[PDB]
Amino acid sequence: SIEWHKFETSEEIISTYLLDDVLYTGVNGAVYTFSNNKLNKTGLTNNNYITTSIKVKDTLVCGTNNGNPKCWKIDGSDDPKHRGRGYAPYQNSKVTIISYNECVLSDINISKEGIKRWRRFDGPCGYDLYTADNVIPKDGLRGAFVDKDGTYDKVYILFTDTIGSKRIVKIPYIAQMCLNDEGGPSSLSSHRWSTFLKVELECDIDGRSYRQIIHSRTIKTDNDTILYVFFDSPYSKSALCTYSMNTIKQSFSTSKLEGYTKQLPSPAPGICLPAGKVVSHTTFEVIEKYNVLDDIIKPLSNQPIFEGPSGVKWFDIKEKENEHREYRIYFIKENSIYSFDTKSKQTRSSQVDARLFSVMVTSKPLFIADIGIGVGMPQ
Numbered sequence: 001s002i003e004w005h006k007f008e009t010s011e012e013i014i015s016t017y018l019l020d021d022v023l024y025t026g027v028n029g030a031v032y033t034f035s036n037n038k039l040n041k042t043g044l045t046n047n048n049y050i051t052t053s054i055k056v057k058d059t060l061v062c063g064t065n066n067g068n069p070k071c072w073k074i075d076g077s078d079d080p081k082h083r084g085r086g087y088a089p090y091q092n093s094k095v096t097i098i099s100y101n102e103c104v105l106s107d108i109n110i111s112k113e114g115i116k117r118w119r120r121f122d123g124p125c126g127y128d129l130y131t132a133d134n135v136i137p138k139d140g141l142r143g144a145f146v147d148k149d150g151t152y153d154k155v156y157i158l159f160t161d162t163i164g165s166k167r168i169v170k171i172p173y174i175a176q177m178c179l180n181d182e183g184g185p186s187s188l189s190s191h192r193w194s195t196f197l198k199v200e201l202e203c204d205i206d207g208r209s210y211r212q213i214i215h216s217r218t219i220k221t222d223n224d225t226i227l228y229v230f231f232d233s234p235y236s237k238s239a240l241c242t243y244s245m246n247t248i249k250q251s252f253s254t255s256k257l258e259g260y261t262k263q264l265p266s267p268a269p270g271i272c273l274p275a276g277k278v279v280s281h282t283t284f285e286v287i288e289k290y291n292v293l294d295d296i297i298k299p300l301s302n303q304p305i306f307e308g309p310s311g312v313k314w315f316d317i318k319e320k321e322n323e324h325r326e327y328r329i330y331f332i333k334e335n336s337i338y339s340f341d342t343k344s345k346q347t348r349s350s351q352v353d354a355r356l357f358s359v360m361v362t363s364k365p366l367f368i369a370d371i372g373i374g375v376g377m378p379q
């Protein structure tokens with residue numbers, strides 16, 4: 001059964017991150033660490049939703065801080081660099097924030113009710129950048145990660161757009177940009193991404209077409225990186241689809257841009273340029289205007305690896321001990337835990353009293369809940 005490490009009293013789980021194999025659980029007014037089977041606590045200010053623990057011991061923890069976003073170190077001391085804006089939201093709402101090589105990227109508004117953008121903050125990868133108006137959905141993102149596209153680091157983000165007039169439709173995308181992007185070709189555009197492209201994802205089966213992304217992660221294989229994307233639906237089902245990043249990178253490399261029929265500029269939109277090389281005026285104008293590939297990415301096997309119940313909140317993966325390239329996939333709903341074996345294709349489930357926020361695998365599955373940190377599978 002699950003070994004529960006309980007909070008003194010049930011908490012509002014606001015965020016969960018793994019850093020160097022240590023689990024950081026942000027709540028309202030505190031952050032908890034879990035490792036070596038011990039749950040420890042750093043209390044912080046109250047009315048302070050801890051949305052953010054990132055690497056920049058020296059772990060930066062940030063929260064709404066009663067409506068004035070603020071960051072601390074894990075020991076509760078104030079952050080010497082006075083980070084706040086862009087590191088925690090202005091209220092308890094969903095955020096996407098990541099750091100890679102100490103570079104921080106975030107969709108967190110940097111002013112209250114500001115325009116929703118995906119930003120890189122000033123740092124080791126270059127000065128601050130932001131997406132153009134409406135490039136990112138009002139809803140923000142559902143996933144973000146850094147991955148090499150051959151030679152260069154690119155940032156990939158997932159999100160579901162909402163469009164249409166007579167009919168409101170949802171559209172899932174993955175978008176790519178260069179981690180070290182130097183921005184636009186003129187002073188006015190110099191802090192805008194210059195390499196942003198997006199491509200539609202597909203996750204269909206038997207007429208069911210999944211659109212709302214819940215959560216995602218990647219898995220490295222011998223020759224590829226596999227992107228796992230869990231979708232929800234307003235119906236009674238959810239769905240997990242997988243994608244080849246090689247396939248996705250090829251599409252960004254070779255697809256034409258929707259609505260643009262002239263030969264693409266050179267160098268091409270969306271590729272990374274050596275430090276000191278700036279995007280050309282023509283490429284930037286085209287990419288700003290035509291940021292969507294004329295393509296749609298099909299999942300591996302052309303359908304979901306599996307369908308589950310709607311309302312799945314999170315999932316994670318653990319590669320099977322002796323069956324390599326096989327996995328156990330854990331996923332959760334508010335009050336239930338599920339696992340899918342990729343080899344057998346059997347799904348198991350159990351109901352729990354705990355209100356589950358996420359599942360994160362270290363050497364075992366950790367289930368983070370209102371009641372605390374649960375170690376190991378139940379049933």
Ligand SMILES: *[C@@H]1O[C@H](CO)[C@@H](O)[C@H](O)[C@H]1NC(C)=O
Nearest residue numbers: 022033034035038039040041
């Ligand atoms: C948690 O507390 C124990 C002492 O009870 C300590 O050994 C351990 O270092 C602490 N863990 C973290 C990550 O602070």
